[PDB]
Amino acid sequence: PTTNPPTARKFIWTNHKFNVSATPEQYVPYSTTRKKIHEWVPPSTPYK
Amino acid sequence: GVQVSPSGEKITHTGQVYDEKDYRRVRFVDRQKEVNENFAIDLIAQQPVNEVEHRIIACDGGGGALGHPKVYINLDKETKTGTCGYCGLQFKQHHH
Amino acid sequence: KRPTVRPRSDVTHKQLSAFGEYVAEILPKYVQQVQVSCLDELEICIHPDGVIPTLTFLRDHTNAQFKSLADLTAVDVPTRQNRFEIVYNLLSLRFNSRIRVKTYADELTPIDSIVSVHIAANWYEREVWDMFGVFFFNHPDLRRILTDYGFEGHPFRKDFPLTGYVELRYDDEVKRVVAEPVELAQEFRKFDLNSPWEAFPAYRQPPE
Amino acid sequence: PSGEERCIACKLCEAICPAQAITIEAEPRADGSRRTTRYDIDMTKCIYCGFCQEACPVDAIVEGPNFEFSTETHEELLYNKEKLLNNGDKWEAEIAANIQADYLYR
Amino acid sequence: LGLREIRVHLCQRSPGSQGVRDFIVQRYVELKKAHPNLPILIRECSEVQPKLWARYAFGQEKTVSLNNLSADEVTRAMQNVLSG
Amino acid sequence: ASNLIEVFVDGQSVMVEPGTTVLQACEKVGMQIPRFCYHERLSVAGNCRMCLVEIEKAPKVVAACAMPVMKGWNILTNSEKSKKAREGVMEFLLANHPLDCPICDQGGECDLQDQSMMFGSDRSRFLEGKRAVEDKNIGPLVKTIMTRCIQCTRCIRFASEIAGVDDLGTTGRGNDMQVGTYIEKMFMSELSGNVIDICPVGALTSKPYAFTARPWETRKTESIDVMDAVGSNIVVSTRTGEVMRILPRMHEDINEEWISDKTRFAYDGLKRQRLTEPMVRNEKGLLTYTSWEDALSRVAGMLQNFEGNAVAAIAGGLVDAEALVALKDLLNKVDSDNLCTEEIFPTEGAGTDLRSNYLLNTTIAGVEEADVVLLVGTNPRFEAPLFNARIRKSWLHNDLKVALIGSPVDLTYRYDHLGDSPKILQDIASGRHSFCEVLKDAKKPMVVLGSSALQRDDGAAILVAVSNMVQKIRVTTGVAAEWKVMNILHRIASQVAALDLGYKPGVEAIRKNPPKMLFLLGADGGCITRQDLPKDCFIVYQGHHGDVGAPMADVILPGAAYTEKSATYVNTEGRAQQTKVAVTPPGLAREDWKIIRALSEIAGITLPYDTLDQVRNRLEEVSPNLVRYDDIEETNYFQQASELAKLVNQEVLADPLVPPQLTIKDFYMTDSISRASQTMAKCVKAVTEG
Amino acid sequence: KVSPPKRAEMKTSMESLIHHFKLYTEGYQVPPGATYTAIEAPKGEFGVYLV
Amino acid sequence: TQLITVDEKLDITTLTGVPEEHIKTRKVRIFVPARNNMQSGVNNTKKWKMEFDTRERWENPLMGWASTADPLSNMVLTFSAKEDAIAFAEKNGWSYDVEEKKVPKPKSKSYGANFSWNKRTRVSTK
Amino acid sequence: TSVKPIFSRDLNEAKRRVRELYRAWYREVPNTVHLMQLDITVKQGRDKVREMFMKNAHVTDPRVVDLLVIKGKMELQETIKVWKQRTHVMRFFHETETPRPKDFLSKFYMGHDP
Ligand code: SF4
Ligand code: SF4
Ligand code: SF4
Ligand code: SF4
Ligand code: FES
Ligand SMILES: [K+]
Ligand SMILES: [Zn+2]
């Protein structure tokens, strides 16, 4: 990649990162979907 | 762009973020929740509208076989640009 | 001629039809059906009482000489009364041929083991018993061969679940490997991959 | 090259995935595009067979040449959409070159 | 002890329900006239035994099988249920 | 073989009636001819040319969907000519069809894709550029991507014949001929998701279902709809434990192939405003989450405190017969007969004693069978859309004569509006009416009285007037004893089951004897409130949605929904059906009869049943027709009911019969799930503003 | 209908895209029947009995 | 000599190996599956099917996947006859609910009805 | 209602085979507990064997009883020559599983399972 450099894109990382396992910057999984069932919210005022 | 909740947690491009009282952020305690910084909706909003001379345009996303399947977009509505269903590029007919 | 269609030779079909007639008229007491497929493979479906005479005749006949047992298997079709279809594939090295012998059984009628005819039938019938629960008479040692020790149920049956009923994990309180009722972190997603349109009109069943 | 995600939430990768290692959830985005809200691939369930990258109609999911990603926990191999997009942004300078080198065969 | 509900289960077509059908045809109307506050629920089905349920106070139920009973002793069974 | 002709399919002989098409003979034999424009419930169009088959000794292939078999025809369905015709027609469709399969909602549900794989070629010769058509905005329910449209006119024929709107059509000519509306018109009637059903391509897709799931991954659960009292058979499509779609089921006696728009698109209300945990009022008067043990202990203590008329229950609309008989048994063990429903039926005369007094006795096949239908005080188009669809089908095919007493509403067919006054019942019963002599000309009349009309103050007077009218009609027309004229149309799913189980209809008993402890089994109509209820009253609301009954309750018990429980619902015909479990209730919500049984056990009066089959046994021993699933056993004793009605001496009011639902905006929100649905909110906004 | 088409044909043609979709979602339908195919494996005879 | 008499209901629950919870507490459904109304094909309405009652599917705390606790969630069995499904269900000891095959009613289809002189079946468009 | 017997013509010698199998299991339980170093005692192992037999005791079909005897002989022989290990033997007791009480209140408090 000095005579034939790769194609430049703006979303490509400008800084390469090595394996970051067992580091504070490691990968932690999570569900990327939002809340699916919305609970009823009781009113904040008493009926009596 | 990446925004933060009142909890301080970054909100993903899907709109997902944990609540203040949700216990599932202990997985991010002493670690990081990684969110992809490049938001595709913002990046495709930055793209200019291609100004073409035809009533029906053809899109493959560029690169020929490296792109998406070739589709045809009908640019009849002059009040709305035609959007590719695959790549999200916008096209507008030049009627001048 | 056609590069996408498998070529067909009818001499094998004629030879296997002649041999099927031969076996059928030699053993009318047991042979229930004889068919030759489009793949030129001879299938002979027999009564369970004639497994020993049929296998012995096919192994020891001068015209048959089916001295090599290819495999012994079972197919679970739980819509018929005798739900286990036991299939014997045999190979004749003298005549360079292959034959298939089919019979039927259910959960409560065992069939005769053919360990006296072929020796690989020992382990193959052990596999069939372990996977389907088909008992075999006069076996030297019929026991489980593939499942876990003390595994309850026969797993190759159609009504047995894919994931099973128990799963193993190490419990530190008892310091052992213990069995739990099975719980999956992600359930196996079943897919209904059947088109609503008929594919092969040659196999169109008549309406009920 | 615009920066839009190539994935169009068409679920053929998880339909063809022989180990059922891909889980996809989708909804229309705020601009109405057909995009995923969840794209999880389990490395501990994946068999690395390339069926997703050969069934993908828009070359979105790929098996890039990274193999030195062994982790110290079982969780870190449970990839989600953010991790897969980060991998795609990291390895785009090489994945695109490999696809350019080999795409005439496939 | 106070009667709260009467339920008559019968058949549209059965020899055992013929007397019950006759009783409902000729005598149910003035029964409802005499007790126009009591639910006499008439339920009929294909293959049920002719059965009579009397629900009293606090959930007690008395069950009387009136299979192959004609109109007059169906009437007297109803009278015994109403009175006690 | 009287009036039958012998034809041959692939050499196999079969008897067919005259007028039977080639496709109908082929499916009688057992082979499904390929089709794109033919639908067995739509009119024959014959334009897609996919059903072309070869008749023996005939040089030209014929369209099986339109051509009738003549005599002795040998239909060579799998011949070379038929295969070549199918290949050519699929090639012509896919020449201009767009490459949109991954971005298509019709992923594995595509008749075009499946028939391509089964009958078409495996490659293309189309080297030209494909056409493209701009999309339309016919509503927030049906998303239109008209480039995928193959111009089969199925949507146009459906809208013309079944929906009865005449709004869709083809504009243009040749390859430029576009299906849609010429003007910017919003196509929103009831029964409008069935165009999404019957569109074979993904041109007309569902906008709530847009880009959500795939048919191969969705699991199918065959259940019953509870949005109205028709009881339409449905499939709940659930993926990963979440309800994803609602589709109709084919049931020729209830709903045919279609479901209402509220049924199809109101499923998203089950994801909002859901009760998940039991709640109790605290010392500050606010609802707070608590445990099942604590909530049931509080309710059990109050139930041990009170008895008699001081304990009462009110049942709403989305209530199954299991919880109804559970609450009935519990209040009977505390000796309470105030088991009321929100929906009102007249108790005068026969009341709910005779089952024929409150049923659609003629039923929906009887709607197809009848010749004149008189609708009294009802708007069937919004009260029971599939019932009105069957009326329109009979009106098209059997030349049904429809008349209406009530306010003049658009029923998507032309009827005779006799007027909105209830005195016309007296006039027809006396026999001095033009429609009375129309009836005496007719042979098999059908008088359908609305439960919405029975909701009025003079409901008993209206019912006895209609009963007297029907008795006079049967006297003056001499109909058969097997033919039932009187019918009652209900709009509430729980009402028929409650009336069968013995619930007293209406809250008149509640108003007469105000209780100190009240159960609200899904009661969200607001019929009885704290203003006409005593001050120190203990309210427990058992339900799945917090809409009207939860904020006024002292204890809230989260029950299950119809998609979350296996349940019994009885339709207007009297037919009982059971919903199956599609998903499970969210949070700590349980099945409603299980909640009532656990409450009874804690209160110390244990109900004599523990399992669902034992609940069905209790239902059978109360009334043994709620266990006869999909059974239409007929009722009798209309003579006795009419005699008691005649001895009822009430008089009708002068108010015109105005149904509560005059417009589709009133149609869209009816119950708690519809009110909590955002899709119905969008529909109301679209039909009001847009 | 059995083997998937080339990717350029899939991205250009309608039938190729449809067949790619159906093959990579449902797969090809095999006509009913039973076969025993045995080949000379390096370890012996490898047999497959497909029904 | 080799033929005995048995007057029972052919119970094999002791040999199936299934736990007693998944025998006694399960309900099965025997039915011809309804045609998917998004299509018009009827090849999936030919064979009888037995399925089990739906059990609990909850959310995984880590990934949000659909976690389950019952093994008979994806178990669907195919039968050529309702009586065969009945025999299998009674043999395996599962309590069954059976619904009959819903066949489409025969319909009088006439292309000439679209162009009638006096009937209401005349269409206004094509 | 006439079928082919497996080993037993009727219930009598089937019960004889049951008694022989129970006799041999009762013999082997102390040897099992001593050889595979089980935490259990001899008494409750014999109780486990007995209540397994009482669990299977409701069947009266001679073919099913013969097959149960055959399976019991396989389990017993598998215990004679030690292939079934300590974990496999201790799987009979479910000591690591919290049992589900059968009352309606408890099954209501846990979840939706009947
Ligand atoms: S490479 Fe992995 S993720 Fe892709 S289809 Fe194969 S097993 Fe599935
Ligand atoms: S990764 Fe590719 S195959 Fe998978 S859903 Fe996205 S676009 Fe489709
Ligand atoms: S309608 Fe069918 S053929 Fe057309 S794009 Fe959609 S899936 Fe493909
Ligand atoms: S929109 Fe659909 S139903 Fe209407 S003509 Fe086009 S393909 Fe047919
Ligand atoms: S189905 Fe007959 S031409 Fe369309
Ligand atoms: K569609
Ligand atoms: Zn594009």
Side-chain angles (χ1 to χ4, degrees), chain I residues 44-94:
Chain I
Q44 60 187 353
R46 291 179 179 177
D47 283 310
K48 174 57 69 173
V49 164
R50 183 190 187 84
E51 62 86 20
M52 278 305 103
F53 268 77
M54 305 318 308
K55 173 177 93 72
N56 277 328
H58 66 90
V59 65
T60 69
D61 198 334
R63 291 164 314 162
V64 186
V65 175
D66 284 327
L67 265 186
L68 281 175
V69 159
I70 284 159
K71 281 167 165 285
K73 292 181 181 179
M74 306 211 200
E75 271 292 272
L76 181 53
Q77 187 274 151
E78 189 176 358
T79 304
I80 301 299
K81 295 183 289 294
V82 179
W83 318 322
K84 164 161 282 209
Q85 295 297 109
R86 179 176 65 189
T87 80
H88 306 90
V89 169
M90 276 319 264
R91 272 162 219 190
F92 281 101
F93 292 94
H94 308 133

Side-chain angles (χ1 to χ4, degrees), chain D residues 35-47:
Chain D
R35 300 298 150 177
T36 61
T37 52
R38 160 212 302 278
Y39 198 97
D40 307 334
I41 300 183
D42 193 355
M43 299 300 93
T44 65
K45 223 177 287 192
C46 174
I47 80 175

Side-chain angles (χ1 to χ4, degrees), chain F residues 5-8 56-57 70-74:
Chain F
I5 48 178
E6 181 200 23
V7 295
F8 304 96
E56 204 172 60
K57 310 182 292 272
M70 182 179 72
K71 176 74 168 51
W73 272 8
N74 196 9

Side-chain angles (χ1 to χ4, degrees), chain A residues 10, chain B residues 43-51 88-91, chain D residues 2:
Chain A
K10 65 182 181 180
Chain B
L43 288 180
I44 205 60
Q46 293 179 356
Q47 281 299 121
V49 183
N50 312 89
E51 186 69 26
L89 282 177
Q90 286 167 288
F91 301 90
Chain D
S2 73

Side-chain angles (χ1 to χ4, degrees), chain F residues 427-576:
Chain F
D427 294 354
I428 296 171
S430 62
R432 38 193 155 81
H433 211 278
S434 56
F435 182 82
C436 184
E437 62 93 23
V438 160
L439 286 165
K440 93 175 60 178
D441 291 331
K443 299 289 94 176
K444 296 170 83 67
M446 170 163 184
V447 176
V448 180
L449 178 53
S451 189
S452 57
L454 292 173
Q455 288 312 103
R456 285 157 52 112
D457 291 331
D458 52 327
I462 285 170
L463 182 55
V464 299
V466 175
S467 288
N468 184 29
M469 182 179 72
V470 169
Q471 191 210 352
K472 192 253 176 186
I473 283 161
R474 299 191 44 110
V475 164
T476 198
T477 51
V479 309
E482 61 86 20
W483 181 252
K484 321 277 182 45
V485 188
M486 179 90 252
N487 303 288
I488 298 285
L489 181 64
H490 299 268
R491 35 183 197 88
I492 296 307
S494 81
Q495 168 85 338
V496 187
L499 292 197
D500 277 358
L501 283 158
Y503 277 57
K504 40 179 68 175
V507 291
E508 190 48 52
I510 302 299
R511 292 196 186 100
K512 181 174 71 176
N513 293 301
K516 287 170 271 187
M517 183 177 177
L518 188 62
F519 283 76
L520 297 181
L521 201 56
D524 289 289
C527 302
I528 284 299
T529 182
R530 298 204 159 260
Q531 287 69 241
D532 50 349
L533 203 62
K535 182 67 181 294
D536 54 293
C537 187
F538 197 75
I539 300 181
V540 56
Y541 171 79
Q542 183 177 2
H544 41 76
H545 271 96
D547 187 25
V548 179
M552 65 179 288
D554 305 3
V555 173
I556 290 170
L557 305 179
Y562 74 106
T563 49
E564 295 152 3
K565 74 200 162 187
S566 179
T568 308
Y569 292 88
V570 179
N571 65 348
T572 50
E573 294 166 304
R575 163 193 276 116

